[PDB]
Design a protein around this nucleic acid. Sequence first.
RNA 1: GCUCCACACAGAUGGAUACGAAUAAGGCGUCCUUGUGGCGUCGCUGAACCAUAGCAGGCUAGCAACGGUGCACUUGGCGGAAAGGCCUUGGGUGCUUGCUGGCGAAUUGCAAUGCGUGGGGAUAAAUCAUUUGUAUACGACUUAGA
RNA 2: GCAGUCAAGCGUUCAUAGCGACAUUGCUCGGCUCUUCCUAUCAUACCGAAGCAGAAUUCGGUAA
RNA 3: AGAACUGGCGAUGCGGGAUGAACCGAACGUAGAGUUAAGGUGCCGGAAUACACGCUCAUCAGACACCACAAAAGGUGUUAGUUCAUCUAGACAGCCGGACGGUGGCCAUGGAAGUCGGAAUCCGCUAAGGAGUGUGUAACAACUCACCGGCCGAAUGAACUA
RNA 4: GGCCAGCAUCAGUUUUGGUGGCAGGAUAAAUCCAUAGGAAUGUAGCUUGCCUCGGUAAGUAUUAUAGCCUGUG
Lengths: 36, 197, 136, 190, 183, 170
Amino acid sequence: MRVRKRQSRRTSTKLKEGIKKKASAHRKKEKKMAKK
Amino acid sequence: VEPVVVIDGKGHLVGRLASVVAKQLLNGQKIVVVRAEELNISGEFFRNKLKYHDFLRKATAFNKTRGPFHFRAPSRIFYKALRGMVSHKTARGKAALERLKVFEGIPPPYDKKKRVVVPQALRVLRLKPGRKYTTLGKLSTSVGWKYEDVVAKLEAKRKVSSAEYYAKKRAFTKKVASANATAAESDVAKQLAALGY
Amino acid sequence: TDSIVKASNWRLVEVGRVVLIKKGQSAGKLAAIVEIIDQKKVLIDGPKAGVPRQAINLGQVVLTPLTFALPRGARTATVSKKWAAAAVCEKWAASSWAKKIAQRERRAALTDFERFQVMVLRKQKRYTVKKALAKA
Amino acid sequence: MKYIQTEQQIEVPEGVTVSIKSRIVKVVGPRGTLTKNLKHIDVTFTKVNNQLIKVAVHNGGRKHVAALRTVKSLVDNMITGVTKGYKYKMRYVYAHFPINVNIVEKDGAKFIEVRNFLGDKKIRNVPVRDGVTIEFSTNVKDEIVLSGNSVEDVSQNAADLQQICRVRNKDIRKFLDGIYVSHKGFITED
Amino acid sequence: GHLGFLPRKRAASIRARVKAFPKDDRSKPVALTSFLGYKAGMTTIVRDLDRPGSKFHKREVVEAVTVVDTPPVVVVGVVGYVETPRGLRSLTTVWAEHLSDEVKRRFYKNWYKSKKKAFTKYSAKYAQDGAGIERELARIKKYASVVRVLVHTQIRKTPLAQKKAHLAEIQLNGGSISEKVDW
Amino acid sequence: HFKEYQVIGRRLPTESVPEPKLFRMRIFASNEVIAKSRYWYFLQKLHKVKKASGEIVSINQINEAHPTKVKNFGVWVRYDSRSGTHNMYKEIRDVSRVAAVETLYQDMAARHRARFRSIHILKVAEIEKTADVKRQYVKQFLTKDLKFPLPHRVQKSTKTFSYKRPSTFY
RNA sequence: GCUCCACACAGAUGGAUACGAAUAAGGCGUCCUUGUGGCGUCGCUGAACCAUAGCAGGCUAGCAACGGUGCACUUGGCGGAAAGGCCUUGGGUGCUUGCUGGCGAAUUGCAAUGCGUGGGGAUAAAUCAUUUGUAUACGACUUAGA
RNA sequence: GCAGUCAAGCGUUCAUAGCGACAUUGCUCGGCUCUUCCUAUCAUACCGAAGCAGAAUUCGGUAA
RNA sequence: AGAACUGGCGAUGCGGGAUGAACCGAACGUAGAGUUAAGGUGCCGGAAUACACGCUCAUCAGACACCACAAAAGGUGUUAGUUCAUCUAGACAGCCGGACGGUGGCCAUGGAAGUCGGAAUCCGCUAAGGAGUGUGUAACAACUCACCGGCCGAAUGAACUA
RNA sequence: GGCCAGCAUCAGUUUUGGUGGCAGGAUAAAUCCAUAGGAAUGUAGCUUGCCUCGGUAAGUAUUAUAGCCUGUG
């Protein structure tokens, strides 16, 4: 068959570093939500 | 140790096979894999086929006569597995590859010549019993290669001639092994024993 | 009209199976499987060979085709009793495998002059053997 | 939990003998011989007393033990395949158009021609496997009998014979027409 | 356009070579599989049409046909090909010992200046009981899975002012390779 | 590789309270320093004390009583997870307590992804009588005259090229 | 290409030592009911096996046996997958360390590895120019002409 | 979407410190022309379900 | 989003993170030798196709990273657990049989006998059988299981967590 | 007296082996030996069932014609 497009496993540097910022954002939320 | 080194790429593992051939070269050792078709990979057929197929889907969009040349022949199919395993764009690479030689089946003067194996890339040893592997002969055929049959045919006949040769061999061996046994316990002999030989 | 199903015969790991240690402090000595611990580890002791009683991996060891009658959990003296009574040491020395090990050790500790004796003796043996052939 | 030893017992009757090297099985007996490759399965056979056979899997997961029982089933199926045999009786029903089932031999293929199914000009050719024999039931209307040694030969041929007669783009409820395996059994009843 | 008919470039020669051949049955009698001539002509035919099921059954149809001129093709050799994992490979060709002026013309681009010394030593190679020719014919019959016939056209019997005939290769679909090489 | 340690502590002797109760426990560790640290970590959880409030009085290596006799151990384990902590009872056949807890720690990491800081070893006991050995994979080895082979053995190569086509007999 | 003259000179260092297939199986030896056959034996590394001693291997005296090997003549058979090599029939011919004699080695000084040109002649062919037009931007192609 | 009805559990013990999914109940800048690609396919190909008598059709699957 | 304090970059080369403004290492004269950091040791690529216990098969696995987003789940993938259950007074599975009479309970209505539907849903008899679990007939019948009982002989069952 | 080298005995920095003496802990724990109890995945024996002649099976039997565990020294 016509073999469809494969997703990449190369994580671009913008993605990888943006992943770190989103992670640390989830921390700051979790520390605040722990107090209530 | 030898000038040349003929590998019997049967029941091997492309990867571990290539990687043990690759470096072997770069170190200036001449090598000639044979019986490539009979080579092996790892994983339920379909699996690989599906794999390759996606590779067979990559072409220089605007001019596909320029992009990744997709080779079928089990050889080439295993030359690309060893190639991308050697800085093949430099000079020290080209010079390396140049002392490498892949053959699907066994032709002369390789036939009439000793042929080794690579334990560290032997499927029987490496793989765990009861775990689908994917011969190379199949994958190839079911993707373009069109000489599976011929070789097969030309391979069976290449064995026969081989068998007979042997037969003759086992005999002449026996004869020598029997004469020797009869040379035992003869001062000289006796002595050697004390010196292991 | 027989039901010939053959065979796939192995060396079973059992209590009283004599083994040969590949690597370690002992390395090349015989021991007997005293007790089986699990799939990977056994308990071994060869008192006459000199190896202390220890828990060892079956990766470290290789089974030899010889067996003897040993009761399970046997202490060193009991192992030495059945070891000597069955005479597994002489049955080991009788085998081709011990002869091959001793063969490599004999060739290792050879002097150059003794190696030159082997040179000369093989020349003489070659002569008589080549005369023994080209006859039949 | 990774079993140390798992075994089944293949019971061999008087008339048959089982010869096995590597993983290729003879069942030589009264009706004939049957052979089966099993080198895909990874087991160990043990003949205990010339009348009982012990299959064996050492160090097997749930997947490997699941293979262990199917060897016992297949080798036993060869045994009952030789002692008793297999007999599949297929009854074919029709509403209006008389189904005309015949055996033809073009180029030595021994085909089964299925003509006039639901008033159809196409002539359905079913291949007959090597070891399955076809005769028609006397004194019973609209019946075809499939008989041989192997379970695969008889039953796959029975499956082929009823999958060529598919009621296409119509009802299931209204159109009864087709060929159907009425009875799965043995040649010699005891 | 049609992407199959690419690259849309000028051919290697006017005589295009046949890319594939009809299969092979090893019980059929020995017969040629392809023929050549010289296309030149076009003309109109009427015929009554015995094509049942048509709107023109037992009616008459006018239609355009073409006339290729085909002088009797002359055999001047045979080629044997071994089956390889690399395709086919010609191991031995054999010729006719005495060939026409037309084919010795095909072997040169400038015909008039030459000493016309084409197959002189090959014909002198024949000049005995055979011995080497029968050796090469044994070589073909022993090996060589397919056998193709070297032919040429009768250019002089055609009104063309070319004088220079075309060599070709035509396989044989008659079984037993022995009967191929002996035909 | 492990070592068993008897580690004691008695919250530092002050005025009006002389000689407190000397809290003793057995700690599996790699060395003395880790054993001490693990002991303080356990004390803070068993009751409300601190590292500065007490003192290590005696640290002692507990050697195994009979390191030649194969035993049938049963280990009561609890450990912190992806969720809340929970008890577990695994049965281990081994020669020594050190080696049995060793096989446990590697198995806990392998099947449950718990590192060294999560695992609280509660109680390691010998199971004296067989047919009281609960787990079936341990009772698997307690049968009479157990004779099992090791089919399909790998032969470890010292070189890259072999001249035999290896025979995986046993 | 042949002939006549003149000149020029990516890593050898004992041997790539050939059954095929299976791996929960095999190899070899023997025997017979000739078979998916019985019995014996082998592996667990090529750590092998074959070759291997002579001024970098000289010169000679022999003794034992019809062997081993080199060189070139030679009877075929075989090899098409890159066959370009494999066995075999013999005659000659040196050498043989199978065993025993007979001579020579220095001073090397205590290490420094120790097959093309530039012209002739003879004869095959190609290109240009001519003609062609199934070709044609120019190239190229197809032609034609002692 | 808002409010309520349930309600696996967790809440620092734990249902009466509270959060709480799927349901459920309340009214209510545009366009001409070409090349290539995607499938989330309108048709063509083969199927499954459908009161699918036949014809016609509806939904769904593979499918570029 | 606002302060404070803190590092880094800025005026800073070099090792590593395949690649690079802020990520890990790192006291820059010119050289020699040894040892290391972070990162690594299949080959590209210098360095173990090391050793040991495990887990995973992915129809485009995974190598990834405060374990952050689609993330709550679905799955008859697989391995470990926990809590309740049965079990040689015979566990689960499997067929073989009983599976009852009041009773065709009342309204319903052409016909509804457990099984189109509306409400209780009771008694007796047992080893156990529901005013009935589905298939079925117009209505019944017949079959089915839930409940027992007969051979069969060791483990099995459910709900959660990882 | 210039260029390059080899060896020896030396000195500084370092890398890599071989072998001896001690000291610590439960003055290692073990093993081994002597003694006292136990159960077993039960050992010889003994009893019993039904068969290919003696194998197996279901009880006893604390080791007797295998052994093991625990305790004290």
